Amino acid sequence: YDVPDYASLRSLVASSGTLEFNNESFNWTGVTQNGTSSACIRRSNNSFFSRLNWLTQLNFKYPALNVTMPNNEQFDKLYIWGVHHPVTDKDQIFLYAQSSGRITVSTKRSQQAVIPNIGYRPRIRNIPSRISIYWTIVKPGDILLINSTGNLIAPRGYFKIRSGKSSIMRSDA
Amino acid sequence: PNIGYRPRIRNIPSRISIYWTIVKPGDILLINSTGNLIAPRGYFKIRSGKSSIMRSDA
Amino acid sequence: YDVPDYASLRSLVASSGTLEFNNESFNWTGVTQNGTSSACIRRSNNSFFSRLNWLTQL
Amino acid sequence: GKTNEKFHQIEKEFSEVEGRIQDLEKYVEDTKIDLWSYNAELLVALENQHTIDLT
Numbered sequence: 583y584d585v586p587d588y589a590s591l592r593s594l595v596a597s598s599g600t601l602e603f604n605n606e607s608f609n610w611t612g613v614t615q616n617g618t619s620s621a622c623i624r625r626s627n628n629s630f631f632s633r634l635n636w637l638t639q640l641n642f643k644y645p646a647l648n649v650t651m652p653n654n655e656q657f658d659k660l661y662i663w664g665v666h667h668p669v670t671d672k673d674q675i676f677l678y679a680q681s682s683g684r685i686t687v688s689t690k691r692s693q694q695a696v697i698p699n700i701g702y703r704p705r706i707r708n709i710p711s712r713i714s715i716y717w718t719i720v721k722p723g724d725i726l727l728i729n730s731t732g733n734l735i736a737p738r739g740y741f742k743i744r745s746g747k748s749s750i751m752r753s754d755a
Numbered sequence: 756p757n758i759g760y761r762p763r764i765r766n767i768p769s770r771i772s773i774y775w776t777i778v779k780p781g782d783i784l785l786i787n788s789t790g791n792l793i794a795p796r797g798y799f800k801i802r803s804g805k806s807s808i809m810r811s812d813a
Numbered sequence: 814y815d816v817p818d819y820a821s822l823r824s825l826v827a828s829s830g831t832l833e834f835n836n837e838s839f840n841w842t843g844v845t846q847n848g849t850s851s852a853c854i855r856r857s858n859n860s861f862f863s864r865l866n867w868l869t870q871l
Numbered sequence: 872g873k874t875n876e877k878f879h880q881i882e883k884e885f886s887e888v889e890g891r892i893q894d895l896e897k898y899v900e901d902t903k904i905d906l907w908s909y910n911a912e913l914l915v916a917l918e919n920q921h922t923i924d925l926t
């Protein structure tokens with residue numbers, strides 16, 4: 583993976599001091615969820631990140647995903663989603679069945695539009711692809727709308743965020 | 756432009772992104788587009804002074 | 814609307830402290846200017862931002 | 872009556888949480904406030920020491 587803004591995500595998560603992950607039931611229809619990879623082994627089995635969801639074509643089809651998730655609670659939500667960049671046009675057609683993907687995650691106050699960039703990268707653990715990870719903060723009363731047509735690493739739920747005295751440290755003591 | 760859906764505000768699901776351009780004296784502003792352009796109507800005069808902005812309810 | 818850099822535009826405009834808008838005659842040919850919207854009402858009529866211009870096909 | 876005037880400064884209070892830039896502005900403002908708070912304590916305590924001594 584490769585976070586485009588590593589220091590920004592590392593600061594607000596460390597300042598919250600909590601990882602209370604709550605699962606939310608989305609409506610991913612027409613796609614195959616729970617995609618696994620051979621470079622991320624869990625209990626001698628192929629697995630992925632536990633807080634993300636890899637979406638893959640179903641019966642050589644991939645309908646456009648228009649799934650909303652309103653925030654009716656009284657605290658801010660931190661959604662962690664990702665964009666997967668393939669290596670070749672053959673792998674893009676094999677995985678998402680569309681030669682040009684696009685991901686749009688928008689709220690009432692902000693919008694994020696990330697287009698995948700197919701290309702080669704240096705191999706890490708015999709994998710030449712990369713994943714870019716973005717975060718979205720949803721206010722109370724705001725509505726999270728996720729629209730994409732491929733190459734989307736869907737989130738599994740929201741991360742609770744608060745303000746406290748927590749911080750981060752780099753030491754070997 | 757990025758075509759896509761957004762949450763509806765005042766029964767409108769579209770968005771407008773706003774950018775600013777500063778033109779120096781002697782510089783030439785060239786605007787080229789083929790669609791989805793919100794054209795400006797004129798320039799805004801800008802100077803340097805003691806002005807500022809403030810958020811209060813007094 | 815949605816400004817990609819809200820704090821940058823809000824800072825330089827407030828530091829200037831003036832809004833002397835001057836109209837400039839452009840050359841928008843082949844398009845229909847003065848596009849209006851139903852979500853921005855002015856004097857019980859459909860209108861838009863007074864400092865912008867919406868371009869639509871002709 | 873020996874004050875100094877400042878017109879335009881950075882934003883010192885924030886509503887939406889941001890990344891590195893918002894953390895830097897909250898640290899520059901906190902550095903100036905704590906340094907001037909110590910300078911006010913040292914100036915008053917030094918002047919009070921001399922005023923009692925001369926009296």
Ligand SMILES: *[C@@H]1O[C@H](CO)[C@@H](O[C@@H]2O[C@H](CO)[C@@H](O[C@@H]3O[C@H](CO[C@H]4O[C@H](CO)[C@@H](O)[C@H](O)[C@@H]4O)[C@@H](O)[C@H](O[C@H]4O[C@H](CO)[C@@H](O)[C@H](O)[C@@H]4O)[C@@H]3O)[C@H](O)[C@H]2NC(C)=O)[C@H](O)[C@H]1NC(C)=O
Nearest residue numbers: 621669670671672701702703704705706707708709710711
């Ligand atoms: C565009 O340019 C890039 C350069 O960045 C090329 O990327 C290289 O591609 C080659 C071949 O595809 C890669 O080589 C592969 O490396 C894998 C990892 O190597 C480690 O593991 C092996 C053991 O498996 C060790 O021996 C090795 O020392 C490393 O520790 C290997 O697993 C691959 O093995 C394959 O070939 C061998 C024969 O040599 C077979 O026996 C295997 O079964 C398997 O098929 C392979 O060697 C290389 O790592 C890539 N990166 C770099 C930086 O070079 C792109 O390939 C190129 N584009 C095109 C279209 O060619």
Ligand SMILES: *[C@@H]1O[C@H](CO)[C@@H](O[C@@H]2O[C@H](CO)[C@@H](O[C@@H]3O[C@H](CO[C@H]4O[C@H](CO)[C@@H](O)[C@H](O)[C@@H]4O)[C@@H](O)[C@H](O[C@H]4O[C@H](CO)[C@@H](O)[C@H](O)[C@@H]4O)[C@@H]3O)[C@H](O)[C@H]2NC(C)=O)[C@H](O)[C@H]1NC(C)=O
Nearest residue numbers: 645646647648684685686728729730731732757758759760
């Ligand atoms: C945000 O979320 C929305 C909601 O899903 C998405 O909207 C869908 O986008 C997909 C994009 O692929 C649309 O699928 C395409 O629809 C086209 C519309 O054609 C219909 O209408 C015409 C009349 O205008 C009829 O004549 C025609 O028969 C259809 O009934 C199709 O033309 C497209 O066809 C393409 O795919 C087929 C394979 O299925 C190829 O054979 C074709 O050659 C062609 O390449 C395609 O089916 C879908 O219709 C949209 N839904 C709605 C409700 O509008 C947004 O895309 C999404 N935004 C983003 C950025 O992802």
Ligand SMILES: *[C@@H]1O[C@H](CO)[C@@H](O[C@@H]2O[C@H](CO)[C@@H](O[C@@H]3O[C@H](CO[C@H]4O[C@H](CO)[C@@H](O)[C@H](O)[C@@H]4O)[C@@H](O)[C@H](O[C@H]4O[C@H](CO)[C@@H](O)[C@H](O)[C@@H]4O)[C@@H]3O)[C@H](O)[C@H]2NC(C)=O)[C@H](O)[C@H]1NC(C)=O
Nearest residue numbers: 648649650651725726727728729760761762763765766768
């Ligand atoms: C992809 O996913 C997004 C989710 O973000 C969908 O967006 C929603 O779309 C629906 C329908 O298109 C929207 O619902 C509409 O809301 C409008 C505003 O609602 C306010 O005003 C009405 C009074 O007009 C109040 O009753 C209401 O409480 C709100 O205060 C309504 O004006 C619309 O009314 C239409 O339907 C009714 C019947 O229910 C008719 O009587 C009307 O004449 C009119 O035709 C409508 O209800 C909704 O707001 C959108 N956003 C969200 C966050 O849900 C996209 O539609 C979806 N893409 C596709 C292709 O489906």
Ligand SMILES: *[C@@H]1O[C@H](CO)[C@@H](O[C@@H]2O[C@H](CO)[C@@H](O[C@@H]3O[C@H](CO[C@H]4O[C@H](CO)[C@@H](O)[C@H](O)[C@@H]4O)[C@@H](O)[C@H](O[C@H]4O[C@H](CO)[C@@H](O)[C@H](O)[C@@H]4O)[C@@H]3O)[C@H](O)[C@H]2NC(C)=O)[C@H](O)[C@H]1NC(C)=O
Nearest residue numbers: 756784785786787788789790791792840841842843844871
């Ligand atoms: C910056 O500003 C410049 C100045 O206007 C813009 O340049 C124009 O760009 C448009 C883009 O659409 C050009 O329009 C296209 O011109 C093509 C050139 O074809 C001519 O030349 C060939 C020989 O090379 C002749 O054989 C042919 O008959 C033409 O005389 C056309 O092929 C295009 O056709 C497309 O549209 C028609 C519908 O009108 C379709 O039927 C076609 O299938 C095809 O899709 C089109 O007409 C225009 O020519 C450019 N002008 C100049 C002077 O170069 C830049 O685009 C602009 N930059 C940006 C980023 O906006």
Ligand SMILES: *[C@@H]1O[C@H](CO)[C@@H](O)[C@H](O)[C@H]1NC(C)=O
Nearest residue numbers: 607608609610611612648649
């Ligand atoms: C999921 O989306 C499909 C769209 O075809 C819709 O029919 C279905 O009711 C949705 N399910 C839920 C739980 O929203």
Ligand SMILES: *[C@@H]1O[C@H](CO)[C@@H](O)[C@H](O)[C@H]1NC(C)=O
Nearest residue numbers: 605613614615616617632635
């Ligand atoms: C995906 O896996 C999770 C747990 O790993 C499970 O709760 C969920 O039902 C699975 N979904 C599908 C479609 O298999």
Ligand SMILES: *[C@@H]1O[C@H](CO)[C@@H](O)[C@H](O)[C@H]1NC(C)=O
Nearest residue numbers: 837838839840841842843844
């Ligand atoms: C506007 O552009 C057209 C291009 O067709 C040109 O003929 C005309 O002279 C221009 N008008 C002005 C005022 O520059």
Ligand SMILES: *[C@@H]1O[C@H](CO)[C@@H](O)[C@H](O)[C@H]1NC(C)=O
Nearest residue numbers: 836844845846847848863866
């Ligand atoms: C657009 O409106 C302005 C004032 O609202 C007017 O001066 C201008 O002539 C109009 N242009 C067109 C093409 O109608």
